[PDB]
Amino acid sequence: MLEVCIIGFGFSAIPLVRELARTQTEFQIISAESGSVWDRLSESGRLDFSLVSSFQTSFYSFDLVRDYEKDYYPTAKQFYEMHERWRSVYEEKIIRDFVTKIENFKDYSLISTRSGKTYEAKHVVLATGFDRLMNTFLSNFDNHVSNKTFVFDTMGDSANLLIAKLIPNNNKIILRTNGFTAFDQEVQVLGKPFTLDQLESPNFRYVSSELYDRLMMSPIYPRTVNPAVSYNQFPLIRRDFSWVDSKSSPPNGLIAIKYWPIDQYYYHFNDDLENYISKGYLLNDIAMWLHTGKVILVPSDTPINFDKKTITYAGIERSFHQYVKGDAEQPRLPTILINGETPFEYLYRDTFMGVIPQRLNNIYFLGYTRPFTGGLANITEMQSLFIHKLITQPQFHQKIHQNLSKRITAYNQHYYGAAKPRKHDHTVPFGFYTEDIARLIGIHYQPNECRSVRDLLFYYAFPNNAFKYRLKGEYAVDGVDELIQKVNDKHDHYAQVFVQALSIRNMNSDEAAEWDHSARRFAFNDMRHKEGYRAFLDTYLKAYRQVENISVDDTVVDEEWNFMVKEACQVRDKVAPNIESKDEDVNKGIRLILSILDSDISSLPDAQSIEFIRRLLQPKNYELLFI
Ligand SMILES: Cc1cc2nc3c(=O)[nH]c(=O)nc-3n(C[C@H](O)[C@H](O)[C@H](O)COP(=O)(O)OP(=O)(O)OC[C@H]3O[C@@H](n4cnc5c(N)ncnc54)[C@H](O)[C@@H]3O)c2cc1C
Ligand SMILES: N[C@@H](Cc1c[nH]c2ccccc12)C(=O)O
Ligand SMILES: N[C@@H](Cc1c[nH]c2ccccc12)C(=O)O
Secondary structure, three states, rough: OEEEEEEOOOOOHHHHHHHHHOOOOOEEEOOOOOOOOHHHHHHHOOOOOOOOHHHHHOOOOOHHHHHHHHOOOOOOOOOOHHHHHHHHHHHEEEEEEOEEEEEEEOOEEEEEOOOOEEEEEEEEOOOOOOOOHHHHHOOOOOOOOOOOOOEEEEOOHHHHHHHHHHHHHHEEEEOOOOOOOEEOEEEOOEEEEEEHHHOOOHHHHOOHHHHHHHOOOOOOOOOOOOOHHHHOOEEEEEEEOOEEEEEEOOOOOOOEEEEEEHHHHHHHHHHHHHHHHHHHOOOOHHHHHHHHOOOOEOOOOOOOOOOOOOEOOOOEEEOOOOOEEOOOOEEEOEEEEEEEOOOOOHHHHEEOOOEOOOOOEEEOOOOOEEEEOOOHHHHHHHHHHHHHHHHHHHHHHHHHHHHHHHHHHHHHHHOOOOOOOOOOEEEOOOOHHHHHHHHOOOOOHHHHHOOEEEHHHHHHHHOOOHHHOOOOOOOOOOHHHHHHHHHHOOOHHHHHHHHHHEEEEEEOOOHHHHHHHHOOOOOOEEOOOOOHHHHHHHHHHHEEEEEEOOOOOOOOOOOOHHHHHHHHHHHHHHHHHOOOOHHHHHHHHHHHOOOOOOOOOOOOOOOHHHHHHHHHOOOOOOOOOOO
């Protein structure tokens, strides 16, 4: 009887296959000939973009220990090459075929295939990814489209990449959305670049719900009156958040765009522009786009008839070339037959940690939990460890499964509360999930085991990347020691972010919000840092048209558009004129912490930072019931 069958092999299954090989557990892989979207994109030569997530969050620990020198954003080419490299290692263990049906019994499943071969396995893992409407626009994108108008009903990373590729051919873009949360992918902290996933310090949730919420929620909720922030200059960017019924912030179910702010784009790529664009580093600054009117926001019920293909905003009847519906992603699940008769219904919320379904035996889901920020790698590595331990250690299997039904109800209570299931339930803060899985496995850190102030920085401020949990214990990876050292030395041990929590502990929601924005450049959607880069933008667009061999006439003026922009940017052209502390508070906080770094916490004497730093040994909201 085959012990483990893995269905689908692309990116998600890679670390589970590694653990099964390591323990010499018996496994076969079934994966389709056709491959993934990355195989589509490679074939048609469209691996010409970059990830919206950092190296440290996007490649697995066993690759990072060998290949990390600095923080950067990998290209689509680099991500693919890394899938392919791992595919080559395991190809001989992969049966090329398509699973059409799984019949699940008490201690085995019967797997049926397109070819007609059947397989019996005790443990089955699905790692099949998602179908995405948007993949076709992307995989079959026509660059000859010039001077046309596009309407998008949804803003996601996929829409944002399409927009990046359209604007250089002077294609005009209308968003007819109920708003969107967007973040600068890279940010300046007193002159050093941090990826947004380095500043989330998630373990501070354990000190209190209320404190973590102040740290994180101001750039997402409309909590500041500061007229520099995109969501005051362009209020139609704001979303309905009435659905949220959870004290856990940022809530599960919140999706965001990650984009290159033009300033950071400038700092990295200005000196070799054509070369960078051709590797896949594309300017996708949605906030620059609103500021320059190259995109505009129109309310979600604006007038448009799909028959004549027109949208009507002001008194211009605007001919549009295409409507883009909205990226829906549903798991590529085969038919699963409960007891071999009753079709299993997939619902993220009715699985434990996105992995363990109810009513099925020895079936696990790998790759169907989405990170709010950072790459999938953080989520799939910890899932691979979770599933590996469940499969190879019957003790662990029993413990989790014993009260699985209550675990799921406790989890849904904590993270979703009473809110109706939503299509984005599968979206979790990465540094919550990695840590949740760490505590179920038992490869977590105990805060009470922190000795020095250094140790408190590691526990609270050092990101909860999967590799953070592979330094020691059951799933230790060699090299992580060195890796953590390099990351610490390049990021001043994450003191800056640790000092953030200190600065806002005594503040309230409103105070915290305005402090977050009292910087010269606040982290996210600072509209003071756009106008300066209008000339670089024109140089960028020129450089893009050179790499993509495009000719377009800028001497040709679409008048119709300019008038539409004026109406969109009204609140902006009124609120932006009223422009003209965090910087100083971090400055002196970092100096204080970089001095008492090796100081014993218990030793610390009875300003009030001190008392709070000592209570970090006994956080009062450590309780997670679903564990
Ligand atoms: C355009 C795009 C950009 C992305 N950018 C990023 C990024 O910047 N950062 C990041 O972290 N993540 C990113 N992702 C998400 C993630 O990294 C990819 O979705 C990744 O391909 C998911 O890996 P997977 O292994 O779960 O699925 P896939 O890579 O799709 O692999 C699943 C495999 O299973 C096969 N298969 C499916 N059904 C069956 C079946 N019934 N039987 C047999 N074989 C089957 C498929 O053919 C495929 O070969 C991006 C995704 C897309 C689409
Ligand atoms: N705590 C940091 C970073 C941060 C806030 N909200 C975020 C959301 C996503 C990623 C990072 C963040 C800040 O206040 O600026
Ligand atoms: N393009 C897909 C998947 C995706 C893009 N970037 C990601 C980063 C992490 C995880 C998944 C993704 C979507 O947003 O629908």
